[PDB]
Write an enzyme that holds these catalytic residues in place. Structure first.
Site, PDB file in Angstrom:
ATOM      1  CB  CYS A 144     -13.596   7.400   1.045  1.00 53.39           C
ATOM      2  SG  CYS A 144     -12.417   6.516   1.807  1.00 53.39           S
ATOM      3  CB  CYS A 192     -13.981   6.632   4.426  1.00 54.99           C
ATOM      4  SG  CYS A 192     -12.495   7.332   3.686  1.00 54.99           S
TER       5      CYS A 192
END
Length: 105
Positions: free
Chosen positions: A32, A35
């Site tokens: 991710c 993220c």
């Protein structure tokens, strides 16, 4: 500043130990990008808001917690008070994240 949760027991015990403090949980994963993008900012909030508890949960480390907390997106921020979920959103949105903390604390 950001305490990594590495079991469902640790998760539950953190929510218990928080008392009445707001707890903010970043559910993340290594695939991710966004993220990873927002991790420094999430750390910054944990240094700015010492009245708030900040936890990281990696969905691969913690699939049980992810599933039990109904996470569907990456990243997801969830917010708790007295062991109860009071908010959640998805996406690496810095303004939304701080503006949620400020609504809840």
């Amino acid at each position: 500043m950001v305490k990594q949760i590495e079991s469902k027991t640790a998760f539950q015990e953190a929510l218990d130990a928080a008392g009445d403090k707001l707890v903010v949980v970043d559910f993340s994963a290594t695939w991710c990008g966004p993220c990873k993008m927002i991790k420094p900012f999430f750390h910054s909030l944990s240094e700015k808001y010492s009245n708030v508890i900040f936890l990281e949960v990696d969905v691969d480390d913690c699939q049980d917690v992810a599933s039990e907390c109904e996470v569907k997106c990456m990243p997801t921020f969830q917010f708790f008070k007295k062991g109860q979920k009071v908010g959640e959103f998805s996406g690496a949105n810095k303004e939304k994240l701080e503006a949620t903390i400020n609504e809840l604390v």
